[PDB]
Each structure stands twice: as C-alpha cells, then as structure tokens.
Amino acid sequence: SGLEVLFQGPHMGGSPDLIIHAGEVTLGEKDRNKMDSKKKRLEKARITEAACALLNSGGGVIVMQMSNKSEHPVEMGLDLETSLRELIPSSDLQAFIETKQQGDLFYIFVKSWSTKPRICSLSSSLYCRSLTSKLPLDSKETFEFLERKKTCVKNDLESNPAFEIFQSERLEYGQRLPFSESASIEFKQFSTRRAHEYIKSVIPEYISAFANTQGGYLLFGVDDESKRVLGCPKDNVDRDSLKAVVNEAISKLPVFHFCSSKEKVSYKTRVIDVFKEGNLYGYLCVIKVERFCCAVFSEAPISWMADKENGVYSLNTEKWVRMMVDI
Amino acid sequence: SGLEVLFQGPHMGSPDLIIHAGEVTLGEKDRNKMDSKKKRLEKARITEAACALLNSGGGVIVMQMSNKSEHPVEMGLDLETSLRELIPSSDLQAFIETKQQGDLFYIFVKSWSSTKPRICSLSSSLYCRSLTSKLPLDSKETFEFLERKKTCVKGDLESNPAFEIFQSERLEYGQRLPFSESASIEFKQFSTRRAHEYIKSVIPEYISAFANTQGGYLLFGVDSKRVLGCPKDNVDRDSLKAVVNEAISKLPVFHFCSSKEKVSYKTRVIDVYLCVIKVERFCCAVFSEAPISWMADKENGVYSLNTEKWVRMMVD
Ligand SMILES: [Zn+2]
Ligand SMILES: [Zn+2]
C-alpha cells in the first residue's frame, strides 16, 4: 500500500508525456480556507506556473501529493480555480482542465491551447493609462493592443497644462496646484521610504502606461487628497542621483518594436527645488514621457512554457510577442 | 494507583459481551473543541460498537478517557445523536446507560427486540426516489420497503419524453425538451472533475433509487436545464460503457424469489459526450452498496454483515 501507479484506470488511449510534479499541495476549499496564508500563495503560484506552461506547450498533466491526504476533497478549491480560469482567455476552464484524485495523488490535466490570443499568461506585464482600472491588460485587452500597434505601422505633451510646473525653476512648500489627477497627470507622494527606492517601484508601471497612451507627466512629491506640493527632504538626495535613478529605472523597461526604429522610450526628467521659506526644504521630481512607436513593458511578461529537455522556463520579452500574435 | 477493576461497585452481573474501543474523549464541553478528524473517527468507532451490540444481545463498550483529570458524565451531543439513529424507536434512555469509573467510561447497551425491524443499522445502503429527500431510507422506511416487497411475492413501463434524447444520436447545446427534471429523470452536470470518477461516484446511489422506483433515466452532463457534456480528450466511448458496466455490476441486489438475474439497464453515449442510462424497474431490491451494519461475538470478533443475512433480519 501507499503506492499509486501513475494513471490507473480502464482508459487505454495514449497517455500524456509532458507531466509536471508540484510536490506537496493541500486541496479542498475547507482545508485551504484556514491554512497558512504564506503556504497558500506558494502552492497557488506553483500550480499556475505549471498549468500555464502546459497550455502553451501542447497539453500535459500536473501531478502532486496531498498534504491533507485522508479527506479526498475531489475539488480543486476556489483560489486555485479562479487563478487557472483567469489564465484561459475564454474562461472556459471546464473545457481545458480535468481533475482526477487517486488515493495519495491528485492530477490536474491541462489541454493544449493551440480573433483570440495565442498564448496564456499569468500577467501581460504591459499597462495602459486607463482611468477605469490600473490593472495590467488581461488576455483580451492585451491581444487587441499588440495587433493594433502592429497594423498601424504595417504638441499635446507641450500644450497640456502640466508643462508650466514641469517648467518651474522653483516651487514653494504647501502651494496648492491647479491640475488634478487626469489621464495625463499622475500624483505620487513620498513616504518614510527612501526617495530612490519609492521612485524605482513606481516608475515601471506608470511610465510604461504613459508611453502606450499619448504620453503624460509623472509628478513625485504631491499629495493626492490635499493636492499640495510637499516633495521629499533635500538632505539625503541630490539632483544627479534622482535623475540617475530614473534613467536606470527607465532603461530596464523592455520594449518590442513592430517597426524598423529601435528607439527606446524617450522622456525628460526634471528635479524642481521646493523651498520651505527661504530655505531649501527638498525636491519635487517630474517626468515627461513621450508616446511610443510600439510597446513598452513594465517588466518581462509573466508567462511560462515547459519542455522535457528545457524544463519549465520563462519567455523572453520579444518572442513572447511573436508567440502572442501573427508578426 | 491508576488501576481499575472493570465492574467496580457492589451493584453491577457483569455483562458477557465486552468490546474495547481505544482512547476516546468524552463530554460535550471537551468533544466540541477536539481535533475534527479524531472526533468523527471516535464517533464511527463508538457507533459501530453500539450497532454490533444492539444486534448481538446484551453487551458493553469500554473505553479509556483521553481527558483523564476532569470527569464529564456526558458523551456529547454528537455521540447521543448517532446512537439515537441506531435505535429505530429513538428512545436512547431505554437502551443506553453510561457509568464513569476513574479513567474508564462504560456504555451499557441493551439487547434489541408489534411490527418493527429486528436489526439496527447505521444506514441502509438502499435508496428510493423521494421528492425533496435524496437520503437513504432510514431503519423504518427500509423495513416498510422490504416488507412491501416481501409480501408482494407471496400473493410505469412507458416511453418517457426522455426516450427522444436517449435515442437522439446527435448532441447540441440548449436542446431543452418538454421533459424537465422528473421523478424518472435526474440531471447531473460534469465539472472540472474527470468523467470516469464522477460517474463511478454517482451511479450506485441513483441507479439504486431508479430501479426501486418504476425505473428512470440518468443524464450525465446536463446543468439551468442546459447540456454541457464532458470533454472529448480524456475519455473514449468504450470507456464510458465499460466504467458503467463495471460500476453497476458490483451493486448488490437481493431477490425475494427464484430470479438470479441482475438489474436490467441500457447505457448509451451520445457524441460531441453525454452519458444516458436507461434502467428498468427491478423485481425486488437493488442496493447502492452493502448495508452498513455490524454484529459481534467472541469467536467471530467485530464483523460486518453481508447483504443477504441483513435482509433476512427483516424477514419473519
Ligand atoms: Zn516602434
Ligand atoms: Zn426478484
């Protein structure tokens, strides 16, 4: 006993070759609901990587062992199903995943995926400036984006109101500001977090979204509610370090071109002096980012494939696009 | 020191049939906040003990209390409830008396046995088609069932609109038909669960109820009254016929007459798959599985009862 043969059953048809072992995983919504929060997300992220790689590599099966062996839950759970269904763009998970529970083992069969997207992904990692929601474009939104920028190839930046404060040589602490957070103007306020580290985290999501949608301005050091100019303290940062952190941060952004141009994202960063009252309190950082030729990503797309020789691996930025559409 | 003679006390004769359960916790206060997996385990262990005693004359079940230091005097509501379901009269007081002696706990069980069942059972693995009641027949309903079928020997077969989908030869969505979920038509939809494992799980319970109630049609892959079916990739037509034939085969049947034939059924798989089962009315009784009931004695130990002898305890 304690031994389970891998695909026991009357079925004699051709058995899967690409299989994946996710180790020990707890199943059933009751056990998963009040289990360790950290352990849940690791198993959740583990299965989604496996299922995503199977969808993109010609089908397979996910093998795993049950930590809560004795229950026989016979259902995947809510958190696991919702992440697997979100992977599939048509959300018809019942057509692509089947589960079999065999004693101490649990299988998740995943069928291959090959006006609809060609690959499945945990996150498209590309953002647009949408007032509705700052979530990354889902499979449907992403496919419309890349095909449109490909077919299109076969100022407002300078006249928008945000230019004058982007052209201010000096600002004053506490001054209210005539613009609001629009589709071209984003307000971000500093915390007790170091200035450079907070900029490095905010840059990839917002500079990317601006470049994909008519450009815009990103202001660091302004409250959202109070809409007051406060900036960050002067002492631990200088003008060269803030501009260098931005330049280092923008450079890491991967871009994919549907055209002959290889220009990376063009921007103009400025550090504006904020005065307390005859004393330099600190700085206010504004970044003007121009519209882009094709696509700008906040990072590499989170999407996986799996082969027997190569194992499970992540996809580069550009071939992920070529696997995504018909280039 | 820590030693207990089993039937201490001046006034107790000591019972003959003593069965020993392991370490169990007692008390509604303590049993409420114990490990969930052990609580159900001790329940099925004590309930199995009581059922075997009720059917095997006088007896007593002895157990050692986990929570030694405190002293309860109550089994807990869940143990009382499980024993009530064993006694068809539900008069717990007249058949159970509990005594606590140090770290030991006794449950004295009175022998069992108007027109009432002669044997007690945890659950009869026999199902019938009761509207808003898809539970197995309790002790009295089962006795009323078997006695009705037992007197029948010593003394609708129509084409339901589901016949059209049974002979549909082709499947497509919607296809809602004049028949809805009836007393002879049950709908079951496939989930992300594999097709074989689900059918193997649903067949015994529902095929039993249909065969015992004028027959019927079992539809796999119908939500909503919508047709969904099962995916094509992991399943072949020959497998569905095979798993149904092997699953219905092990369903135990008992005849009150000379017929030894098993229940007649006809399976049919419609493509693009939808599994439909035509099951005919049965001569006597079809069980979903072996009836869950025990007896116990010294030469034999604690043993489960075969399907045949269990029914004969409902005979004269
Ligand atoms: Zn371009
Ligand atoms: Zn018969």
Author numbering:
A (entry chain A): -1 to 112, 120 to 159, 179 to 351
B (entry chain C): -1 to 10, 12 to 112, 119 to 160, 180 to 247, 250 to 298, 307 to 350
Task: Reproduce the article's own wording on this structure.
Schlafen proteins (SLFNs) were first discovered in regulating mice thymocyte development, and then found to span across mammals with great diversity. SLFNs were reported to be interferon (IFN)-inducible, and their functions have been implicated in various biological processes including cell differentiation, tumour suppression, immune response regulation and the restriction of viruses. All SLFNs share a specific N-terminal AAA_4 domain (Pfam04326, termed N′-domain in this paper) which has a very limited sequence homology to other known proteins and was reportedly involved in tRNA manipulation for certain members. Investigation of the structure and subsequent functional analysis reveals that SLFN13 is a novel tRNA/rRNA-targeting RNase with potent anti-HIV activity.
To gain a functional insight into the Schlafen family, we determined the crystal structure of SLFN13′s N′-domain. 15 vector-encoded residues fused N-terminally to rSLFN1314–353 are clearly discernable in the model. The dimerisation of His6-tagged rSLFN1314–353 is likely mediated by the artificial N-terminus. Surface electrostatic potential analysis of rSLFN13-N revealed two positively charged patches inside the valley, whose width is exactly suitable for accommodating base-paired RNA. Substitution of conserved charged residues (Lys38, Arg39, Lys42, Arg217, Lys224, Lys276) to alanine resulted in reduced nucleolytic activity, suggesting that rSLFN13-N may embrace base-paired RNA within its valley. Apart from the positively charged patches, a negatively charged area formed by conserved Glu205, Glu210 and Asp248 of the C-lobe is also observed at the rim of the valley. Mutating any of the three residues diminished the nucleolytic activity of rSLFN13-N and hSLFN13-N. Even at elevated enzyme concentration, E205A and E210A mutants were absolutely inactive, which differed from other single-point mutants (D34A, E47A, E84A, E96A, E146A, D193A, E221A, E229A, E249A, D259A, E323A, D350A) regarding exposed and relatively conserved aspartates or glutamates.
